[PDB]
Amino acid sequence: MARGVRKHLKRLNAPKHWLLDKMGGIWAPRPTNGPHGLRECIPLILILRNRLHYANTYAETSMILQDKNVLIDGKPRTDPTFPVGFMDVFEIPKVHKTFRVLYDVKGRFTLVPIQSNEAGFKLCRVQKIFLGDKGMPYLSTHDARTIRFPHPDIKTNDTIKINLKTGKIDEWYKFDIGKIVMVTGGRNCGRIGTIQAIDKHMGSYTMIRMKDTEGTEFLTRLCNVFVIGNDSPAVAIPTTKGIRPDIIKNRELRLRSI
Amino acid sequence: GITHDKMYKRSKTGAVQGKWHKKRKYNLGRQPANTKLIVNEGQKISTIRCRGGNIKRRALRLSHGSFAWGSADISHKARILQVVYNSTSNELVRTNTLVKGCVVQIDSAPFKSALSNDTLDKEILDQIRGDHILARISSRPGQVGTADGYILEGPELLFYQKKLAPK
């Protein structure tokens, strides 16, 4: 038993959906605690170095970040291991590039470019309502943020729109049958569909049945069902509309691209 | 040192398990406070640095406490005279050692100074016109550094009166 917390991370023990080469090295970056957890995040350096390719080493990324060249939800971050998560705003003014971090059908993080009109807010999932000091009602979300004095009409598992400049709630979408959702965990990450059924078991998990646009049906637990509007998405989504092709069609697409 | 780990016990079949590691600091214990009634000397309370930087205070000597008469909603700070009954053992009584559940006699002055003029339970009033009132301890000295309680009421009062009357 280790006598304290863990600070390192072996490369082979890192999450698969990070797509890290086996021979890159013994070690992988260890994300620091923040808005998102280890298994539902991706470090900034990976995006800035292994994807966009604006840097070729750790040091270059360190200089870029300490020179204030990236804003996360309107706030400059200088930590190369800062965790980036789902429905986050990634803006680089020096090149006028703005991206929203979402999931691809394969189950990995992707950068969807956005516009100026929709980059002043983000969507958050409310999963906990509790009373704080002095009995004051509170409310928490998936990105580690708390808001005091929420509307009584807002319940758990709902979705909340908040302005980036000011953490004030505008409108909220209820968790109900007939609402477009997006799956954010498990075997079905990145799929988009509409809720058709809700079944609860006393003392255990609650299972949600969803149907895709094409008629396919799939199941997942409520812990990773994210509402993204009322029958139509509230934000811009990837070019594909949450359709996972079968191995045959993916092979055809690969051969075509070959 | 003192520990409460279960590795040094026997199994449900009565077998010797065996030992596979040295002692750990999470599983430690400490010597009892043995809080004493006062009856260089004065109220003495110590402080203990517990896991996580948390602070725990154990009382070694004390003489006063807050007591409540629930039926009439009367509460004052009163001086504790001596311990008269304890279910665990009579040795604690002889030594006047304070623990949760001890039955004690308190001074009647703070209560009689305002009582004996309103209709209430006869028995508490008969105690009030005397020098002491039977009471109980509800806090945990050794963990919070205090000795509070409440005044006995009905069937429990009869139980303890019948217990201590022959003595």
Partner: protein, 216 residues
């Protein structure tokens, strides 16, 4: 060997001197005396007669220092805590066991630390110079409370480059402005929170609330 180097220090003028002793019989009166004990200078009548001295320390023939409350003529071992004397720690909670000479004086010593508390009118080879200047505002204000200007002098000392300690505990515009801004911010925060509570309470007219009522 058989001797003792006596070191004398003068705190009033900051002068210190040392001397040599080759005998014990003359110094028997020094035997049995403890640290912080008056010691008449009559032992060394020539040049030190009619002078009162206080014993402050020493070292035994092996080099072991003398501790205070041991009350012994022989050295001994004890567990020394951090921040105590005759022990230089390494970590922040480390203890160490080492030998120390007993406080009581005896022939076994090889050194003596003594100070001069009262003396006669005679001159002795043994003024106090100052190597540094006071740095805090209160000190200098004392030596050239509720002082509005907060200005000061600068003549100091010079060595060519002029070197003066920087003054501390001085308040000017930056500190005054910073404190005022902080106060204003705290007041604004409290007012905003109170307003939010008031409007939330104004809402919920069709439901129940539970909060800690502000007393006083």
């Amino acid at each position: 060997g058989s001797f003792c180097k006596v070191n004398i220090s003068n705190p009033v003028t900051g002068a210190n001197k040392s001397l040599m002793i080759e005998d014990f019989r003359k110094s028997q009166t020094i035997h049995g005396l403890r640290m912080a004990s008056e010691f008449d200078g009559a032992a060394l009548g020539e040049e030190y007669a009619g002078c009162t001295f206080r014993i402050t320390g020493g070292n035994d023939a092996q080099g072991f220092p003398m501790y205070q409350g041991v009350l012994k003529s022989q050295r001994a071992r004890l567990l020394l805590r951090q921040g105590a004397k005759c022990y230089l720690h390494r970590r922040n909670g480390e203890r160490k066991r080492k030998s120390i000479r007993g406080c009581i004086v005896g022939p076994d010593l090889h050194a003596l630390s003594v100070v001069l508390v009262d003396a006669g009118d005679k001159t002795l080879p043994g003024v106090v110079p100052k190597r540094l200047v006071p740095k805090r505002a209160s000190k200098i204000r004392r030596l050239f409370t509720k002082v509005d200007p907060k200005d000061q002098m600068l003549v100091c000392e010079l060595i060519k480059k002029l070197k003066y300690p920087k003054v501390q505990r001085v308040v000017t515009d930056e500190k005054y402005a910073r404190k005022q801004r902080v106060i204003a911010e705290k007041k604004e925060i409290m007012r905003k929170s109170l307003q939010q509570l008031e409007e939330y309470k104004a809402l919920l007219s069709r439901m129940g609330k539970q909060h800690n009522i502000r007393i006083y």
